[PDB]
Enzyme design. Sequence first.
Site, PDB file in Angstrom:
ATOM      1  N   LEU A  19      54.004   7.315  47.545  1.00 47.69           N
ATOM      2  CA  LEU A  19      54.935   7.254  46.741  1.00 47.69           C
ATOM      3  C   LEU A  19      56.493   7.921  47.237  1.00 47.69           C
ATOM      4  O   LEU A  19      57.655   7.370  46.679  1.00 47.69           O
ATOM      5  CB  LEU A  19      54.873   7.633  45.334  1.00 47.69           C
ATOM      6  CG  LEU A  19      53.634   6.852  44.739  1.00 47.69           C
ATOM      7  CD1 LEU A  19      53.359   7.412  43.240  1.00 47.69           C
ATOM      8  CD2 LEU A  19      53.862   5.233  44.504  1.00 47.69           C
ATOM      9  N   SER A  21      58.074  11.557  49.908  1.00 45.17           N
ATOM     10  CA  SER A  21      58.046  12.671  50.943  1.00 45.17           C
ATOM     11  C   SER A  21      59.294  13.298  51.029  1.00 45.17           C
ATOM     12  O   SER A  21      60.336  12.748  51.044  1.00 45.17           O
ATOM     13  CB  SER A  21      57.490  12.457  52.066  1.00 45.17           C
ATOM     14  OG  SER A  21      57.328  13.354  53.019  1.00 45.17           O
ATOM     15  N   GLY A  22      59.054  14.387  51.219  1.00 49.20           N
ATOM     16  CA  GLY A  22      60.226  15.495  51.602  1.00 49.20           C
ATOM     17  C   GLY A  22      59.921  16.878  52.041  1.00 49.20           C
ATOM     18  O   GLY A  22      58.710  16.934  52.754  1.00 49.20           O
ATOM     19  N   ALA A  23      60.728  18.007  52.120  1.00 48.89           N
ATOM     20  CA  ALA A  23      60.501  19.182  52.339  1.00 48.89           C
ATOM     21  C   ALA A  23      59.398  19.692  51.424  1.00 48.89           C
ATOM     22  O   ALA A  23      58.516  20.627  51.900  1.00 48.89           O
ATOM     23  CB  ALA A  23      61.766  19.966  52.659  1.00 48.89           C
ATOM     24  N   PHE A  24      59.426  19.361  50.356  1.00 50.21           N
ATOM     25  CA  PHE A  24      58.275  19.907  49.283  1.00 50.21           C
ATOM     26  C   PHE A  24      56.746  19.506  50.024  1.00 50.21           C
ATOM     27  O   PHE A  24      56.080  20.264  49.688  1.00 50.21           O
ATOM     28  CB  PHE A  24      58.735  19.348  47.804  1.00 50.21           C
ATOM     29  CG  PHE A  24      58.636  18.065  47.770  1.00 50.21           C
ATOM     30  CD1 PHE A  24      57.576  17.163  47.587  1.00 50.21           C
ATOM     31  CD2 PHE A  24      59.828  17.253  48.134  1.00 50.21           C
ATOM     32  CE1 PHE A  24      57.378  15.953  47.220  1.00 50.21           C
ATOM     33  CE2 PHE A  24      59.803  15.764  47.885  1.00 50.21           C
ATOM     34  CZ  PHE A  24      58.675  15.048  47.456  1.00 50.21           C
ATOM     35  N   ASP A 136      66.050  22.785  37.940  1.00 51.32           N
ATOM     36  CA  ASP A 136      66.300  21.677  38.854  1.00 51.32           C
ATOM     37  C   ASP A 136      66.417  20.290  38.132  1.00 51.32           C
ATOM     38  O   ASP A 136      65.747  19.267  38.744  1.00 51.32           O
ATOM     39  CB  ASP A 136      65.119  21.448  39.741  1.00 51.32           C
ATOM     40  CG  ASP A 136      65.613  20.592  40.976  1.00 51.32           C
ATOM     41  OD1 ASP A 136      64.974  20.578  42.040  1.00 51.32           O
ATOM     42  OD2 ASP A 136      66.607  19.939  41.121  1.00 51.32           O
ATOM     43  N   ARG A 140      66.638  12.419  39.507  1.00 49.46           N
ATOM     44  CA  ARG A 140      65.788  12.374  40.416  1.00 49.46           C
ATOM     45  C   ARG A 140      64.413  12.786  40.009  1.00 49.46           C
ATOM     46  O   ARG A 140      63.118  12.615  40.109  1.00 49.46           O
ATOM     47  CB  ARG A 140      65.940  12.904  41.556  1.00 49.46           C
ATOM     48  CG  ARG A 140      66.320  14.371  41.711  1.00 49.46           C
ATOM     49  CD  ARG A 140      66.621  14.739  43.082  1.00 49.46           C
ATOM     50  NE  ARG A 140      67.112  16.404  43.202  1.00 49.46           N
ATOM     51  CZ  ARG A 140      68.189  16.622  42.705  1.00 49.46           C
ATOM     52  NH1 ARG A 140      69.256  15.888  42.663  1.00 49.46           N
ATOM     53  NH2 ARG A 140      68.581  17.989  43.094  1.00 49.46           N
ATOM     54  N   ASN A 141      64.654  14.031  38.866  1.00 54.59           N
ATOM     55  CA  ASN A 141      63.389  14.817  38.376  1.00 54.59           C
ATOM     56  C   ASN A 141      63.053  14.389  36.993  1.00 54.59           C
ATOM     57  O   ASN A 141      62.497  14.942  36.332  1.00 54.59           O
ATOM     58  CB  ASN A 141      63.574  16.129  38.307  1.00 54.59           C
ATOM     59  CG  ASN A 141      63.539  16.848  39.861  1.00 54.59           C
ATOM     60  OD1 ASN A 141      62.703  16.252  40.623  1.00 54.59           O
ATOM     61  ND2 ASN A 141      64.510  17.798  40.220  1.00 54.59           N
ATOM     62  N   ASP A 154      58.816  18.370  37.517  1.00 58.46           N
ATOM     63  CA  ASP A 154      59.293  19.287  38.590  1.00 58.46           C
ATOM     64  C   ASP A 154      59.718  20.793  37.951  1.00 58.46           C
ATOM     65  O   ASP A 154      60.478  21.449  38.460  1.00 58.46           O
ATOM     66  CB  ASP A 154      60.132  18.712  39.617  1.00 58.46           C
ATOM     67  CG  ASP A 154      59.500  17.936  40.691  1.00 58.46           C
ATOM     68  OD1 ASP A 154      58.432  18.288  40.976  1.00 58.46           O
ATOM     69  OD2 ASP A 154      60.221  17.137  41.254  1.00 58.46           O
TER      70      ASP A 154
HETATM   71  C1  LIG Z   1      64.216   9.850  42.178  1.00 59.74           C
HETATM   72  C2  LIG Z   1      63.187   9.366  43.749  1.00 59.74           C
HETATM   73  C3  LIG Z   1      62.000   9.838  43.565  1.00 59.74           C
HETATM   74  O1  LIG Z   1      61.787  10.943  42.909  1.00 59.74           O
HETATM   75  N1  LIG Z   1      60.954   9.045  43.721  1.00 59.74           N
HETATM   76  C4  LIG Z   1      59.630   9.305  43.655  1.00 59.74           C
HETATM   77  C5  LIG Z   1      59.155  10.256  44.593  1.00 59.74           C
HETATM   78  C6  LIG Z   1      57.716  10.686  44.689  1.00 59.74           C
HETATM   79  C7  LIG Z   1      56.985  10.465  43.495  1.00 59.74           C
HETATM   80  C8  LIG Z   1      57.768   9.518  42.572  1.00 59.74           C
HETATM   81  C9  LIG Z   1      56.811   8.992  41.584  1.00 59.74           C
HETATM   82  C10 LIG Z   1      56.747   7.891  41.121  1.00 59.74           C
HETATM   83  N2  LIG Z   1      55.761   7.586  40.243  1.00 59.74           N
HETATM   84  C11 LIG Z   1      55.479   8.840  39.817  1.00 59.74           C
HETATM   85  N3  LIG Z   1      54.541   9.044  39.045  1.00 59.74           N
HETATM   86  C12 LIG Z   1      54.223  10.390  38.655  1.00 59.74           C
HETATM   87  N4  LIG Z   1      54.704  11.591  39.709  1.00 59.74           N
HETATM   88  C13 LIG Z   1      55.484  11.190  40.575  1.00 59.74           C
HETATM   89  N5  LIG Z   1      55.990  12.010  41.181  1.00 59.74           N
HETATM   90  C14 LIG Z   1      55.622  13.193  40.945  1.00 59.74           C
HETATM   91  C15 LIG Z   1      56.559  14.267  40.621  1.00 59.74           C
HETATM   92  C16 LIG Z   1      56.089  15.627  40.160  1.00 59.74           C
HETATM   93  C17 LIG Z   1      55.074  15.929  40.195  1.00 59.74           C
HETATM   94  C18 LIG Z   1      54.114  15.156  40.704  1.00 59.74           C
HETATM   95  C19 LIG Z   1      52.749  15.828  40.754  1.00 59.74           C
HETATM   96  N6  LIG Z   1      53.068  16.842  40.577  1.00 59.74           N
HETATM   97  N7  LIG Z   1      54.429  17.187  40.151  1.00 59.74           N
HETATM   98  C20 LIG Z   1      54.658  18.381  39.829  1.00 59.74           C
HETATM   99  C21 LIG Z   1      54.567  18.322  38.364  1.00 59.74           C
HETATM  100  C22 LIG Z   1      53.858  17.829  37.558  1.00 59.74           C
HETATM  101  C23 LIG Z   1      53.627  17.864  36.236  1.00 59.74           C
HETATM  102  C24 LIG Z   1      54.663  19.154  35.686  1.00 59.74           C
HETATM  103  C25 LIG Z   1      55.359  19.974  36.386  1.00 59.74           C
HETATM  104  C26 LIG Z   1      55.415  19.776  37.795  1.00 59.74           C
HETATM  105  C27 LIG Z   1      54.142  13.785  41.117  1.00 59.74           C
HETATM  106  C28 LIG Z   1      55.840   9.791  40.675  1.00 59.74           C
HETATM  107  C29 LIG Z   1      58.772   9.111  42.894  1.00 59.74           C
END
Ligand SMILES: *CCC(=O)Nc1cccc(-c2c[nH]c3ncnc(Nc4ccc5c(cnn5Cc5ccccc5)c4)c23)c1
Length: 267
Positions: A19, A21-24, A136, A140-141, A154
Amino acid sequence: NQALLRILKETEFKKIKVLGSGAFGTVYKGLWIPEKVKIPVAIKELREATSPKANKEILDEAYVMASVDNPHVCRLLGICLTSTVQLIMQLMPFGCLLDYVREHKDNIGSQYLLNWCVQIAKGMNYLEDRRLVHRDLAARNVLVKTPQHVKITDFGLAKLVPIKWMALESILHRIYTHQSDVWSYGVTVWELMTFGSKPYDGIPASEISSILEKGERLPQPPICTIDVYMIMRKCWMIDADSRPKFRELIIEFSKMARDPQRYLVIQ
Ligand SMILES: *CCC(=O)Nc1cccc(-c2c[nH]c3ncnc(Nc4ccc5c(cnn5Cc5ccccc5)c4)c23)c1
């Protein structure tokens, strides 16, 4: 508390698709299979061995992330501690709110926008009540479960530099408070009202502090009436205590959401 966070084995979940990717690290769309069920989940695998954080300190922070209980804040479902930290969360099928508004700009009305500002403010107010600083907040978050249901994500991932979203005191003194989150919220609102424009587009990160010192702020979005803009402008005050609180941000944006066409002018 302890039962709120699930410790996942490597056999319980399967990465299917990428879905982002980045530095994280990397986020995958996955299947959680604990019980004759298959749960769609998102799996964030953090980059390996970035720091020497011990497992006990990691799980202590994950317990906090699994304990959040608010409709507009993402909750950590599970964690898998191997060579990397893998964080498991329910799948948000519409992606981040920033990409959503950019792709659906033509079909977004005033009620959707103000409903988003309300929900983001509610999630942040919950984090502040839990005495948690996000550090943060940005479009985007914010993740979109359904078009009318968004959640902040995040938070706490910083524990184990977005200059253009940071309050001046965070840039200059690395001070982070709930009132510095209010600054980031104002920028987040600006992102939504411009349908995903980049703040201070073209300006290098090292020039942002002098822009803010000069008194320059992000320009009024065309659709925002003066009422909406002065709320955003108040979020960007130098004196953090004079910025709005998230509690009153919920109130005013809730009042505006009752009659959205009065406060946002969309073609
Ligand atoms: C705005 C561009 C962007 O961020 N696109 C992107 C990149 C990566 C993943 C996702 C994405 C899309 N659908 C998703 N559903 C659920 N999660 C994510 N990404 C995501 C974000 C944060 C995260 C996780 C897993 N763990 N964390 C950290 C976290 C989780 C819960 C509470 C606190 C921190 C997945 C999705 C879109």
